[PDB]
PDB file of all heavy atoms in Angstrom:
ATOM      1  N   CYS A   1      82.106 118.403 177.749  1.00 16.64           N
ATOM      2  CA  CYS A   1      81.789 117.658 176.504  1.00 16.64           C
ATOM      3  C   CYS A   1      82.026 118.601 175.322  1.00 16.64           C
ATOM      4  O   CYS A   1      82.817 118.244 174.416  1.00 16.64           O
ATOM      5  CB  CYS A   1      80.348 117.155 176.457  1.00 16.64           C
ATOM      6  SG  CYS A   1      79.973 115.755 177.539  1.00 16.64           S
ATOM      7  N   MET A   2      81.404 119.782 175.366  1.00 16.30           N
ATOM      8  CA  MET A   2      81.393 120.752 174.235  1.00 16.30           C
ATOM      9  C   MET A   2      82.776 121.393 174.085  1.00 16.30           C
ATOM     10  O   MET A   2      83.303 121.480 172.944  1.00 16.30           O
ATOM     11  CB  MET A   2      80.305 121.809 174.444  1.00 16.30           C
ATOM     12  CG  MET A   2      78.920 121.206 174.418  1.00 16.30           C
ATOM     13  SD  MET A   2      77.527 122.382 174.413  1.00 16.30           S
ATOM     14  CE  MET A   2      77.397 122.676 176.174  1.00 16.30           C
ATOM     15  N   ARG A   3      83.376 121.791 175.201  1.00 16.42           N
ATOM     16  CA  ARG A   3      84.732 122.393 175.222  1.00 16.42           C
ATOM     17  C   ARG A   3      85.723 121.432 174.548  1.00 16.42           C
ATOM     18  O   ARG A   3      86.491 121.870 173.674  1.00 16.42           O
ATOM     19  CB  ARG A   3      85.116 122.668 176.668  1.00 16.42           C
ATOM     20  CG  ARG A   3      86.498 123.264 176.841  1.00 16.42           C
ATOM     21  CD  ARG A   3      86.673 123.711 178.280  1.00 16.42           C
ATOM     22  NE  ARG A   3      88.023 124.225 178.388  1.00 16.42           N
ATOM     23  CZ  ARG A   3      88.401 125.435 178.011  1.00 16.42           C
ATOM     24  NH1 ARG A   3      87.520 126.300 177.532  1.00 16.42           N
ATOM     25  NH2 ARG A   3      89.672 125.775 178.125  1.00 16.42           N
ATOM     26  N   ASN A   4      85.731 120.178 174.984  1.00 14.93           N
ATOM     27  CA  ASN A   4      86.703 119.152 174.537  1.00 14.93           C
ATOM     28  C   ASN A   4      86.496 118.915 173.044  1.00 14.93           C
ATOM     29  O   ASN A   4      87.505 118.739 172.350  1.00 14.93           O
ATOM     30  CB  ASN A   4      86.610 117.888 175.396  1.00 14.93           C
ATOM     31  CG  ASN A   4      87.149 118.086 176.801  1.00 14.93           C
ATOM     32  OD1 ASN A   4      88.067 118.868 176.987  1.00 14.93           O
ATOM     33  ND2 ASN A   4      86.609 117.371 177.787  1.00 14.93           N
ATOM     34  N   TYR A   5      85.256 118.959 172.551  1.00 15.25           N
ATOM     35  CA  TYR A   5      84.993 118.804 171.102  1.00 15.25           C
ATOM     36  C   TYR A   5      85.662 119.958 170.349  1.00 15.25           C
ATOM     37  O   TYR A   5      86.350 119.697 169.338  1.00 15.25           O
ATOM     38  CB  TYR A   5      83.501 118.690 170.769  1.00 15.25           C
ATOM     39  CG  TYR A   5      83.268 118.315 169.324  1.00 15.25           C
ATOM     40  CD1 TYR A   5      83.020 117.008 168.961  1.00 15.25           C
ATOM     41  CD2 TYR A   5      83.372 119.251 168.307  1.00 15.25           C
ATOM     42  CE1 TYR A   5      82.822 116.650 167.638  1.00 15.25           C
ATOM     43  CE2 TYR A   5      83.197 118.903 166.975  1.00 15.25           C
ATOM     44  CZ  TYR A   5      82.941 117.589 166.635  1.00 15.25           C
ATOM     45  OH  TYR A   5      82.764 117.215 165.331  1.00 15.25           O
ATOM     46  N   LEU A   6      85.486 121.195 170.833  1.00 14.68           N
ATOM     47  CA  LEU A   6      85.980 122.425 170.162  1.00 14.68           C
ATOM     48  C   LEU A   6      87.512 122.486 170.203  1.00 14.68           C
ATOM     49  O   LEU A   6      88.106 122.885 169.202  1.00 14.68           O
ATOM     50  CB  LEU A   6      85.333 123.660 170.805  1.00 14.68           C
ATOM     51  CG  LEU A   6      83.844 123.819 170.513  1.00 14.68           C
ATOM     52  CD1 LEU A   6      83.270 125.016 171.259  1.00 14.68           C
ATOM     53  CD2 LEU A   6      83.599 123.949 169.018  1.00 14.68           C
ATOM     54  N   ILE A   7      88.107 122.076 171.328  1.00 12.61           N
ATOM     55  CA  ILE A   7      89.591 122.072 171.487  1.00 12.61           C
ATOM     56  C   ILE A   7      90.185 121.053 170.508  1.00 12.61           C
ATOM     57  O   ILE A   7      91.123 121.417 169.772  1.00 12.61           O
ATOM     58  CB  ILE A   7      89.987 121.761 172.945  1.00 12.61           C
ATOM     59  CG1 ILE A   7      89.299 122.708 173.934  1.00 12.61           C
ATOM     60  CG2 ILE A   7      91.499 121.775 173.109  1.00 12.61           C
ATOM     61  CD1 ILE A   7      89.655 122.448 175.380  1.00 12.61           C
ATOM     62  N   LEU A   8      89.604 119.854 170.445  1.00 10.37           N
ATOM     63  CA  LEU A   8      90.054 118.744 169.564  1.00 10.37           C
ATOM     64  C   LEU A   8      89.905 119.168 168.108  1.00 10.37           C
ATOM     65  O   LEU A   8      90.783 118.928 167.309  1.00 10.37           O
ATOM     66  CB  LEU A   8      89.167 117.530 169.841  1.00 10.37           C
ATOM     67  CG  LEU A   8      89.797 116.386 170.621  1.00 10.37           C
ATOM     68  CD1 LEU A   8      91.095 116.791 171.267  1.00 10.37           C
ATOM     69  CD2 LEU A   8      88.842 115.851 171.654  1.00 10.37           C
ATOM     70  N   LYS A   9      88.787 119.795 167.813  1.00  9.55           N
ATOM     71  CA  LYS A   9      88.511 120.267 166.429  1.00  9.55           C
ATOM     72  C   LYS A   9      89.661 121.179 165.990  1.00  9.55           C
ATOM     73  O   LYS A   9      90.318 120.862 164.980  1.00  9.55           O
ATOM     74  CB  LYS A   9      87.171 121.008 166.377  1.00  9.55           C
ATOM     75  CG  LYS A   9      86.783 121.558 165.011  1.00  9.55           C
ATOM     76  CD  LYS A   9      85.453 122.284 165.012  1.00  9.55           C
ATOM     77  CE  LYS A   9      85.073 122.830 163.653  1.00  9.55           C
ATOM     78  NZ  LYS A   9      83.771 123.536 163.690  1.00  9.55           N
ATOM     79  N   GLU A  10      89.882 122.265 166.736  1.00 11.44           N
ATOM     80  CA  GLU A  10      90.981 123.231 166.448  1.00 11.44           C
ATOM     81  C   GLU A  10      92.305 122.474 166.214  1.00 11.44           C
ATOM     82  O   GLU A  10      92.986 122.787 165.228  1.00 11.44           O
ATOM     83  CB  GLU A  10      91.064 124.230 167.600  1.00 11.44           C
ATOM     84  CG  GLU A  10      92.237 125.199 167.513  1.00 11.44           C
ATOM     85  CD  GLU A  10      92.513 125.897 168.838  1.00 11.44           C
ATOM     86  OE1 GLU A  10      93.091 125.261 169.729  1.00 11.44           O
ATOM     87  OE2 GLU A  10      92.134 127.075 168.983  1.00 11.44           O
ATOM     88  N   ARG A  11      92.644 121.465 167.029  1.00 13.04           N
ATOM     89  CA  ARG A  11      93.963 120.762 166.913  1.00 13.04           C
ATOM     90  C   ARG A  11      93.977 119.868 165.667  1.00 13.04           C
ATOM     91  O   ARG A  11      95.033 119.788 164.998  1.00 13.04           O
ATOM     92  CB  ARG A  11      94.293 119.949 168.165  1.00 13.04           C
ATOM     93  CG  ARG A  11      94.300 120.750 169.455  1.00 13.04           C
ATOM     94  CD  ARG A  11      95.270 121.927 169.444  1.00 13.04           C
ATOM     95  NE  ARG A  11      95.010 122.812 170.569  1.00 13.04           N
ATOM     96  CZ  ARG A  11      95.454 122.597 171.803  1.00 13.04           C
ATOM     97  NH1 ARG A  11      96.238 121.563 172.053  1.00 13.04           N
ATOM     98  NH2 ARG A  11      95.142 123.433 172.783  1.00 13.04           N
ATOM     99  N   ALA A  12      92.855 119.242 165.335  1.00 12.14           N
ATOM    100  CA  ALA A  12      92.740 118.395 164.129  1.00 12.14           C
ATOM    101  C   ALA A  12      92.878 119.265 162.878  1.00 12.14           C
ATOM    102  O   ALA A  12      93.623 118.849 161.994  1.00 12.14           O
ATOM    103  CB  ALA A  12      91.444 117.635 164.128  1.00 12.14           C
ATOM    104  N   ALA A  13      92.192 120.419 162.814  1.00 10.22           N
ATOM    105  CA  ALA A  13      92.301 121.397 161.697  1.00 10.22           C
ATOM    106  C   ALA A  13      93.759 121.838 161.525  1.00 10.22           C
ATOM    107  O   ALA A  13      94.254 121.809 160.384  1.00 10.22           O
ATOM    108  CB  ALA A  13      91.424 122.603 161.929  1.00 10.22           C
ATOM    109  N   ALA A  14      94.413 122.253 162.612  1.00  9.33           N
ATOM    110  CA  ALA A  14      95.822 122.704 162.603  1.00  9.33           C
ATOM    111  C   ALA A  14      96.672 121.569 162.038  1.00  9.33           C
ATOM    112  O   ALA A  14      97.478 121.819 161.128  1.00  9.33           O
ATOM    113  CB  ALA A  14      96.268 123.094 163.986  1.00  9.33           C
ATOM    114  N   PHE A  15      96.441 120.354 162.533  1.00 13.15           N
ATOM    115  CA  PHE A  15      97.142 119.131 162.067  1.00 13.15           C
ATOM    116  C   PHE A  15      97.044 119.037 160.540  1.00 13.15           C
ATOM    117  O   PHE A  15      98.099 118.974 159.899  1.00 13.15           O
ATOM    118  CB  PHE A  15      96.572 117.885 162.744  1.00 13.15           C
ATOM    119  CG  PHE A  15      97.137 116.603 162.204  1.00 13.15           C
ATOM    120  CD1 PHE A  15      98.480 116.316 162.365  1.00 13.15           C
ATOM    121  CD2 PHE A  15      96.343 115.716 161.495  1.00 13.15           C
ATOM    122  CE1 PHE A  15      99.015 115.145 161.857  1.00 13.15           C
ATOM    123  CE2 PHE A  15      96.877 114.542 160.984  1.00 13.15           C
ATOM    124  CZ  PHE A  15      98.217 114.265 161.157  1.00 13.15           C
ATOM    125  N   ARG A  16      95.825 119.056 159.985  1.00 10.52           N
ATOM    126  CA  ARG A  16      95.558 118.837 158.537  1.00 10.52           C
ATOM    127  C   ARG A  16      96.081 120.015 157.683  1.00 10.52           C
ATOM    128  O   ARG A  16      96.543 119.752 156.539  1.00 10.52           O
ATOM    129  CB  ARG A  16      94.063 118.581 158.319  1.00 10.52           C
ATOM    130  CG  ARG A  16      93.561 117.223 158.802  1.00 10.52           C
ATOM    131  CD  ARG A  16      94.102 115.994 158.052  1.00 10.52           C
ATOM    132  NE  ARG A  16      93.682 114.766 158.715  1.00 10.52           N
ATOM    133  CZ  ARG A  16      94.133 113.530 158.466  1.00 10.52           C
ATOM    134  NH1 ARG A  16      95.033 113.292 157.520  1.00 10.52           N
ATOM    135  NH2 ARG A  16      93.647 112.524 159.168  1.00 10.52           N
ATOM    136  N   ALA A  17      96.065 121.246 158.209  1.00 12.44           N
ATOM    137  CA  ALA A  17      96.446 122.478 157.476  1.00 12.44           C
ATOM    138  C   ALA A  17      97.965 122.703 157.533  1.00 12.44           C
ATOM    139  O   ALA A  17      98.453 123.580 156.797  1.00 12.44           O
ATOM    140  CB  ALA A  17      95.694 123.686 158.021  1.00 12.44           C
ATOM    141  N   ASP A  18      98.696 121.987 158.381  1.00 12.15           N
ATOM    142  CA  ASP A  18     100.154 122.215 158.599  1.00 12.15           C
ATOM    143  C   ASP A  18     100.936 121.665 157.405  1.00 12.15           C
ATOM    144  O   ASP A  18     100.892 120.465 157.153  1.00 12.15           O
ATOM    145  CB  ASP A  18     100.594 121.578 159.920  1.00 12.15           C
ATOM    146  CG  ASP A  18     102.092 121.565 160.193  1.00 12.15           C
ATOM    147  OD1 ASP A  18     102.862 121.884 159.285  1.00 12.15           O
ATOM    148  OD2 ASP A  18     102.470 121.210 161.311  1.00 12.15           O
ATOM    149  N   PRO A  19     101.715 122.493 156.665  1.00  9.22           N
ATOM    150  CA  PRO A  19     102.465 122.000 155.505  1.00  9.22           C
ATOM    151  C   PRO A  19     103.410 120.830 155.826  1.00  9.22           C
ATOM    152  O   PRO A  19     103.609 120.000 154.976  1.00  9.22           O
ATOM    153  CB  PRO A  19     103.283 123.196 154.997  1.00  9.22           C
ATOM    154  CG  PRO A  19     102.778 124.422 155.755  1.00  9.22           C
ATOM    155  CD  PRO A  19     101.931 123.933 156.913  1.00  9.22           C
ATOM    156  N   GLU A  20     103.975 120.782 157.032  1.00  9.19           N
ATOM    157  CA  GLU A  20     104.896 119.694 157.462  1.00  9.19           C
ATOM    158  C   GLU A  20     104.113 118.380 157.607  1.00  9.19           C
ATOM    159  O   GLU A  20     104.681 117.308 157.313  1.00  9.19           O
ATOM    160  CB  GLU A  20     105.565 120.068 158.775  1.00  9.19           C
ATOM    161  CG  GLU A  20     106.893 119.381 158.979  1.00  9.19           C
ATOM    162  CD  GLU A  20     107.673 119.964 160.137  1.00  9.19           C
ATOM    163  OE1 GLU A  20     107.483 121.170 160.425  1.00  9.19           O
ATOM    164  OE2 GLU A  20     108.444 119.212 160.759  1.00  9.19           O
ATOM    165  N   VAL A  21     102.855 118.464 158.053  1.00  7.98           N
ATOM    166  CA  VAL A  21     101.951 117.286 158.139  1.00  7.98           C
ATOM    167  C   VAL A  21     101.620 116.825 156.715  1.00  7.98           C
ATOM    168  O   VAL A  21     101.734 115.607 156.466  1.00  7.98           O
ATOM    169  CB  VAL A  21     100.692 117.585 158.958  1.00  7.98           C
ATOM    170  CG1 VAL A  21      99.667 116.484 158.787  1.00  7.98           C
ATOM    171  CG2 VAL A  21     101.024 117.822 160.426  1.00  7.98           C
ATOM    172  N   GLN A  22     101.280 117.750 155.805  1.00  4.68           N
ATOM    173  CA  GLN A  22     100.950 117.404 154.393  1.00  4.68           C
ATOM    174  C   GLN A  22     102.138 116.695 153.733  1.00  4.68           C
ATOM    175  O   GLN A  22     101.908 115.689 153.052  1.00  4.68           O
ATOM    176  CB  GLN A  22     100.483 118.647 153.640  1.00  4.68           C
ATOM    177  CG  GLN A  22      99.107 119.116 154.115  1.00  4.68           C
ATOM    178  CD  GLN A  22      98.843 120.554 153.764  1.00  4.68           C
ATOM    179  OE1 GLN A  22      99.602 121.168 153.018  1.00  4.68           O
ATOM    180  NE2 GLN A  22      97.769 121.097 154.312  1.00  4.68           N
ATOM    181  N   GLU A  23     103.362 117.178 153.945  1.00  4.03           N
ATOM    182  CA  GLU A  23     104.599 116.538 153.419  1.00  4.03           C
ATOM    183  C   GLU A  23     104.729 115.144 154.037  1.00  4.03           C
ATOM    184  O   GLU A  23     105.093 114.214 153.303  1.00  4.03           O
ATOM    185  CB  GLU A  23     105.833 117.382 153.736  1.00  4.03           C
ATOM    186  CG  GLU A  23     107.139 116.747 153.286  1.00  4.03           C
ATOM    187  CD  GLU A  23     108.297 117.728 153.319  1.00  4.03           C
ATOM    188  OE1 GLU A  23     108.200 118.747 152.620  1.00  4.03           O
ATOM    189  OE2 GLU A  23     109.268 117.504 154.076  1.00  4.03           O
ATOM    190  N   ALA A  24     104.453 115.015 155.341  1.00  3.28           N
ATOM    191  CA  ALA A  24     104.555 113.743 156.084  1.00  3.28           C
ATOM    192  C   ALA A  24     103.492 112.756 155.577  1.00  3.28           C
ATOM    193  O   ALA A  24     103.810 111.548 155.465  1.00  3.28           O
ATOM    194  CB  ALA A  24     104.448 114.001 157.561  1.00  3.28           C
ATOM    195  N   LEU A  25     102.303 113.248 155.209  1.00  6.92           N
ATOM    196  CA  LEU A  25     101.223 112.408 154.620  1.00  6.92           C
ATOM    197  C   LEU A  25     101.670 111.860 153.259  1.00  6.92           C
ATOM    198  O   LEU A  25     101.364 110.690 152.983  1.00  6.92           O
ATOM    199  CB  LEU A  25      99.924 113.209 154.518  1.00  6.92           C
ATOM    200  CG  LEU A  25      99.222 113.460 155.855  1.00  6.92           C
ATOM    201  CD1 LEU A  25      98.213 114.600 155.731  1.00  6.92           C
ATOM    202  CD2 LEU A  25      98.542 112.200 156.367  1.00  6.92           C
ATOM    203  N   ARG A  26     102.378 112.650 152.448  1.00  4.19           N
ATOM    204  CA  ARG A  26     102.956 112.192 151.143  1.00  4.19           C
ATOM    205  C   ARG A  26     104.096 111.199 151.392  1.00  4.19           C
ATOM    206  O   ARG A  26     104.162 110.218 150.649  1.00  4.19           O
ATOM    207  CB  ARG A  26     103.511 113.353 150.308  1.00  4.19           C
ATOM    208  CG  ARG A  26     102.463 114.175 149.568  1.00  4.19           C
ATOM    209  CD  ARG A  26     103.100 115.401 148.928  1.00  4.19           C
ATOM    210  NE  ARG A  26     102.347 116.561 149.383  1.00  4.19           N
ATOM    211  CZ  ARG A  26     102.841 117.618 150.019  1.00  4.19           C
ATOM    212  NH1 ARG A  26     104.134 117.742 150.249  1.00  4.19           N
ATOM    213  NH2 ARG A  26     102.029 118.579 150.407  1.00  4.19           N
ATOM    214  N   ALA A  27     104.967 111.441 152.378  1.00  4.67           N
ATOM    215  CA  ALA A  27     106.080 110.525 152.740  1.00  4.67           C
ATOM    216  C   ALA A  27     105.507 109.146 153.115  1.00  4.67           C
ATOM    217  O   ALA A  27     106.129 108.137 152.762  1.00  4.67           O
ATOM    218  CB  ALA A  27     106.918 111.106 153.861  1.00  4.67           C
ATOM    219  N   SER A  28     104.348 109.097 153.786  1.00  6.38           N
ATOM    220  CA  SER A  28     103.661 107.852 154.219  1.00  6.38           C
ATOM    221  C   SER A  28     102.735 107.320 153.108  1.00  6.38           C
ATOM    222  O   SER A  28     102.124 106.235 153.300  1.00  6.38           O
ATOM    223  CB  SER A  28     102.932 108.081 155.522  1.00  6.38           C
ATOM    224  OG  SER A  28     103.820 108.561 156.527  1.00  6.38           O
ATOM    225  N   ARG A  29     102.630 108.048 151.988  1.00  2.56           N
ATOM    226  CA  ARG A  29     101.894 107.655 150.756  1.00  2.56           C
ATOM    227  C   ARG A  29     100.389 107.535 151.047  1.00  2.56           C
ATOM    228  O   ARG A  29      99.744 106.692 150.430  1.00  2.56           O
ATOM    229  CB  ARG A  29     102.463 106.350 150.185  1.00  2.56           C
ATOM    230  CG  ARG A  29     103.753 106.531 149.392  1.00  2.56           C
ATOM    231  CD  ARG A  29     104.993 106.449 150.268  1.00  2.56           C
ATOM    232  NE  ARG A  29     105.394 105.064 150.466  1.00  2.56           N
ATOM    233  CZ  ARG A  29     106.080 104.595 151.511  1.00  2.56           C
ATOM    234  NH1 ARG A  29     106.456 105.383 152.500  1.00  2.56           N
ATOM    235  NH2 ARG A  29     106.396 103.312 151.558  1.00  2.56           N
ATOM    236  N   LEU A  30      99.830 108.363 151.927  1.00  2.09           N
ATOM    237  CA  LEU A  30      98.351 108.482 152.086  1.00  2.09           C
ATOM    238  C   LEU A  30      97.720 108.925 150.760  1.00  2.09           C
ATOM    239  O   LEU A  30      96.529 108.606 150.547  1.00  2.09           O
ATOM    240  CB  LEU A  30      97.998 109.468 153.205  1.00  2.09           C
ATOM    241  CG  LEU A  30      98.002 108.899 154.628  1.00  2.09           C
ATOM    242  CD1 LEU A  30      96.898 107.883 154.812  1.00  2.09           C
ATOM    243  CD2 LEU A  30      99.351 108.297 154.992  1.00  2.09           C
ATOM    244  N   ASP A  31      98.467 109.623 149.896  1.00  2.00           N
ATOM    245  CA  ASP A  31      97.943 110.100 148.588  1.00  2.00           C
ATOM    246  C   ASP A  31      97.842 108.893 147.650  1.00  2.00           C
ATOM    247  O   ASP A  31      96.817 108.782 146.938  1.00  2.00           O
ATOM    248  CB  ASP A  31      98.759 111.263 147.996  1.00  2.00           C
ATOM    249  CG  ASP A  31     100.267 111.053 147.913  1.00  2.00           C
ATOM    250  OD1 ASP A  31     100.764 110.067 148.496  1.00  2.00           O
ATOM    251  OD2 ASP A  31     100.935 111.920 147.303  1.00  2.00           O
ATOM    252  N   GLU A  32      98.851 108.020 147.652  1.00  2.00           N
ATOM    253  CA  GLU A  32      98.824 106.769 146.860  1.00  2.00           C
ATOM    254  C   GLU A  32      97.673 105.886 147.336  1.00  2.00           C
ATOM    255  O   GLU A  32      97.108 105.192 146.506  1.00  2.00           O
ATOM    256  CB  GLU A  32     100.150 106.021 146.944  1.00  2.00           C
ATOM    257  CG  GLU A  32     101.237 106.663 146.120  1.00  2.00           C
ATOM    258  CD  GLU A  32     102.331 105.698 145.686  1.00  2.00           C
ATOM    259  OE1 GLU A  32     102.040 104.491 145.464  1.00  2.00           O
ATOM    260  OE2 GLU A  32     103.475 106.153 145.589  1.00  2.00           O
ATOM    261  N   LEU A  33      97.323 105.914 148.626  1.00  2.00           N
ATOM    262  CA  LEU A  33      96.219 105.070 149.153  1.00  2.00           C
ATOM    263  C   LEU A  33      94.911 105.501 148.493  1.00  2.00           C
ATOM    264  O   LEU A  33      94.050 104.625 148.247  1.00  2.00           O
ATOM    265  CB  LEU A  33      96.124 105.207 150.670  1.00  2.00           C
ATOM    266  CG  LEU A  33      95.014 104.400 151.319  1.00  2.00           C
ATOM    267  CD1 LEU A  33      95.351 102.910 151.286  1.00  2.00           C
ATOM    268  CD2 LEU A  33      94.794 104.864 152.747  1.00  2.00           C
ATOM    269  N   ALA A  34      94.772 106.805 148.239  1.00  2.00           N
ATOM    270  CA  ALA A  34      93.536 107.423 147.707  1.00  2.00           C
ATOM    271  C   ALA A  34      93.443 107.217 146.189  1.00  2.00           C
ATOM    272  O   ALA A  34      92.433 107.634 145.634  1.00  2.00           O
ATOM    273  CB  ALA A  34      93.495 108.895 148.074  1.00  2.00           C
ATOM    274  N   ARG A  35      94.458 106.623 145.546  1.00  2.00           N
ATOM    275  CA  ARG A  35      94.502 106.385 144.074  1.00  2.00           C
ATOM    276  C   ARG A  35      94.020 104.972 143.762  1.00  2.00           C
ATOM    277  O   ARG A  35      94.408 104.012 144.431  1.00  2.00           O
ATOM    278  CB  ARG A  35      95.918 106.546 143.500  1.00  2.00           C
ATOM    279  CG  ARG A  35      96.425 107.984 143.446  1.00  2.00           C
ATOM    280  CD  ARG A  35      97.345 108.241 142.269  1.00  2.00           C
ATOM    281  NE  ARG A  35      98.752 108.113 142.638  1.00  2.00           N
ATOM    282  CZ  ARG A  35      99.456 109.014 143.339  1.00  2.00           C
ATOM    283  NH1 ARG A  35      98.889 110.123 143.783  1.00  2.00           N
ATOM    284  NH2 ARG A  35     100.735 108.789 143.606  1.00  2.00           N
ATOM    285  N   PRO A  36      93.149 104.780 142.748  1.00  3.99           N
ATOM    286  CA  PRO A  36      92.718 103.433 142.362  1.00  3.99           C
ATOM    287  C   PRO A  36      93.912 102.504 142.086  1.00  3.99           C
ATOM    288  O   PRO A  36      94.873 102.932 141.507  1.00  3.99           O
ATOM    289  CB  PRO A  36      91.852 103.685 141.123  1.00  3.99           C
ATOM    290  CG  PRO A  36      91.295 105.093 141.349  1.00  3.99           C
ATOM    291  CD  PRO A  36      92.441 105.836 142.001  1.00  3.99           C
ATOM    292  N   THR A  37      93.841 101.273 142.594  1.00  6.39           N
ATOM    293  CA  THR A  37      94.871 100.211 142.449  1.00  6.39           C
ATOM    294  C   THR A  37      95.049  99.876 140.963  1.00  6.39           C
ATOM    295  O   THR A  37      96.216  99.816 140.515  1.00  6.39           O
ATOM    296  CB  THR A  37      94.499  98.984 143.286  1.00  6.39           C
ATOM    297  OG1 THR A  37      94.472  99.403 144.648  1.00  6.39           O
ATOM    298  CG2 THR A  37      95.451  97.821 143.108  1.00  6.39           C
TER     299      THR A  37
END
């Protein structure tokens, strides 16, 4: 239970901190989603 939480955490952090993921989040307009309509 605890191991799997810690392994998933590390992979989610890496995901969010990766510059290629951040560029991909802008390409999918997740930033526009966070802006008032």
